[PDB]
Design a protein around this nucleic acid. Structure first.
Lengths: 228, 51, 52, 33, 51, 50, 83, 230
RNA sequence: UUGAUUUGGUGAGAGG
């Protein structure tokens, strides 16, 4: 009663934020077990930090409009949600950015502390039409795990925040997409086996194999109790 | 006898060698089409659904 | 296999798209009435296994 | 398949041969009678 | 034959849902199929056209 | 036949579902919201597509 | 690898002459003496022929030039070996 | 990382076969993941002993009939394929069933050894009708997993066995039905935790905490390929 | 130099 251990045969690194972990061969009906377990953990349980709240002057709710910008505040909320930040020591850091002049505002323009850094400084935030326009936002960064959206965030909150605070979806987990297939491999007698092909694309702040190893050790330490 | 070494020989003669699948009342030319084989544990031709 | 919440897998999966075109709707009433027949059979199997 | 059921071969037919009714290709089974 | 109301009434004698349809989960993903599906017992035959 | 039913059930809409009228920063997190169990496959939504 | 031959059809624009040019080339590789002009990924001589066609280095003119070059090499070999 | 770890807190036996088991506490969202993974492993890959070769005296092939019995020999082989055995020490044992006299032949009539335990003393096999009839079969019980059938085991068997041993298909898996439920946990300070209520249905031969421990070890040793190498 | 017979033809039934 002995099981087939696989060898990790391939990391086809397409880009720095892309991978394809070809993996073979497993027992019949085990590729779906490993793939689905890793996929659910990587979607809704992997820890990490991103932007949750932001306080901007000139706005009172999510459907107002500040001057000097081509885009609107839904677009600044969405481009803020796309920003990937990492916090090392603490877990509740407030950041503030101020920009004036003819030109777009990028992620490198922000004021940063010693504990935080930006993994993509050329990630755009907004663009500025007026040289007299002075944008200002107070960007708070918490740290949780997985995904929590602004809809159930505003359903769960009850304390009256000051007017000008904006909620955003908290993309805590650093992966953007994981989707696998199960193909069919062959050990020389039994054709019933199956080969895993895990695809993964993340943001910055991590290397896809590091995310896979993190999810695997999360599940192993979760199941570490009742083993032999 | 079908020993253990002829299946690797078979996967090395299949690889880039198309076959003509043909349904028995062929009416127009799309009823003979050439595929590449993928070997099947079984006794039935697995045929891609769109085709 | 697709298991219901009781835990039993289903044995054979057919395809619903055959049913609007091939207008043989009797297989669905056979399906529901056979489901009811085995519902009575499972009920008797409980009443006789957990013996009364 | 390829087994022998009834040895049924003649001499003068080296020059001897194998007409011995065998089992057809692809089938298995148990001789029931 | 049996009318439909008697099928529903017999499905109420057994403890089964009246619509004939049970919610089914998926064995691969463990998560529910939306829009409940039909499960029942059909008398299926094996015809002598063997592969 | 099966695949057009899968598409016609996928790309459709209903007047209320999970995640009605929320806003999404791309199609990747649209599939991530469908898989995690926070929205429905047909729920009208502003996305940002390129 | 190979799924479609569409670029090879683009560079030899007849779609019926593609088979003949790639067959002449794949007979130059199969029996054949010759070695391919392209790296082989354990593809067969069919796919290596069509894969040479797609990158634009085998057509009918190149094969006739190479066979004239081999005919001249055999001519010079016969003349320099005998005389 | 504010995670926790689960334990098997309460293991209730509803009967000797059908038996539930809790798991507590699980983190948020982990319930369906562990439940579906333990379902797939616990249905595919459990070790259980089953009948493999049946040797009746005076019977050549399985499609004959015998003196003094009801069920025919294919019926006897099916009723023996349903048998539920639980060996402890060895991995391959040979039992013996000898019985004469009018009446049914239960599974409780097998002359057991010390390390084999037949857990179904009302499993019927034969219905002996003649009082001058006898039946002396010698069963062989291996131990494996999955489903290995007679066709593949027609040439796979290396140990050259003699002719006259009927080959029965091997249904090795002793788990037949398993369902898990993700309830709401009763944690005195947390509300975002859940419990996993796995409801097994065994062959009677497997111990449920042992089955869960083995499935957990299978899952951990499969994931070690992800953990260690990349 | 190391081995062998249906196609032929009729009738009936079946599959797509």
């Amino acid at each position: 009663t002995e099981f087939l251990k696989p060898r990790l045969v391939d990391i086809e690194q397409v880009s720095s934020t892309h991978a394809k972990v070809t993996l073979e061969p497993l027992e019949r009906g085990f590729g779906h077990t490993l793939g689905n377990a890793l996929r659910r953990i990587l979607l809704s349980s992997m820890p990490g930090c991103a932007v949750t709240e932001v306080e901007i002057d000139g706005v009172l709710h999510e459907y107002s409009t500040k001057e000097g910008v081509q885009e609107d505040i839904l677009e600044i909320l969405l481009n803020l949600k796309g920003l990937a930040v990492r916090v090392q020591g603490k877990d509740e850091v407030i950041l503030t950015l101020n920009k004036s002049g003819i030109g777009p505002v990028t992620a490198a323009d922000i004021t940063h502390d010693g504990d935080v850094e930006i993994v993509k400084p050329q990630h755009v935030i907004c663009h500025l039409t007026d040289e007299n326009a002075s944008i200002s936002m107070r960007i708070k960064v918490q740290r949780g795990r997985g995904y929590v959206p602004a809809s159930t965030r505003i359903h769960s909150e009850e304390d009256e925040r000051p007017i000008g605070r904006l909620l955003v979806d908290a993309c805590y987990s650093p992966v953007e997409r994981i989707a696998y297939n199960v193909e069919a491999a062959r050990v020389e007698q039994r054709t019933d086996l199956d080969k895993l092909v895990i695809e993964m694309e993340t943001n910055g702040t991590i290397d896809p194999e590091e995310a896979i190893r993190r999810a695997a050790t999360i599940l192993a330490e979760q199941l570490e109790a009742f083993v032999d | 006898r079908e020993e253990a070494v002829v299946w690797d020989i078979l996967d090395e003669v299949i690889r880039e060698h198309p076959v003509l699948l043909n349904r028995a009342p062929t009416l127009h030319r799309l009823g003979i089409q050439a595929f590449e084989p993928v070997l099947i544990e079984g006794k039935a031709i697995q045929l891609h659904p769109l085709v | 296999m697709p298991y219901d919440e009781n835990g039993t897998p289903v044995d054979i999966v057919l395809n619903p798209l055959g049913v609007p075109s091939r207008m043989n709707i009797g297989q669905i009433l056979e399906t529901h009435l056979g489901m009811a027949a085995k519902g009575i059979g499972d009920k008797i199997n409980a009443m006789l296994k957990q013996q009364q | 398949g390829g087994d022998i059921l009834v040895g049924k071969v003649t001499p003068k037919g080296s020059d001897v041969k194998d007409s011995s009714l065998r089992v057809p290709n692809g089938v298995s089974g148990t001789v029931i009678d | 034959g049996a009318k439909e109301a008697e099928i529903k009434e017999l499905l109420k004698l057994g403890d089964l849902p009246t619509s004939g349809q049970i919610r089914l989960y998926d064995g691969r993903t463990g998560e529910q199929f939306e829009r409940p599906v039909t499960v029942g017992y059909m008398y299926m035959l094996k015809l002598n056209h063997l592969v | 036949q099966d695949v057009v039913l899968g598409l016609y059930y996928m790309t459709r809409d209903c007047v209320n579902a999970k995640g009605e009228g929320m806003v999404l920063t791309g199609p990747k997190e649209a599939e991530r919201l469908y898989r995690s169990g926070l929205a429905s496959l047909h729920a009208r939504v502003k996305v940002r597509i390129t | 690898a190979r799924v479609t031959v569409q670029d090879a059809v683009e560079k030899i624009g007849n779609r019926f002459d593609l088979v003949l040019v790639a067959a002449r080339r794949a007979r130059q590789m199969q029996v054949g003496g010759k070695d391919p002009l392209v790296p082989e990924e354990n593809d067969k001589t069919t796919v290596i022929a069509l894969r040479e066609i797609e990158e634009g280095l085998i057509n009918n003119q190149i094969l006739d030039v190479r066979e004239r070059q081999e005919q001249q090499e055999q001519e010079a070999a016969e003349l320099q070996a005998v005389t």
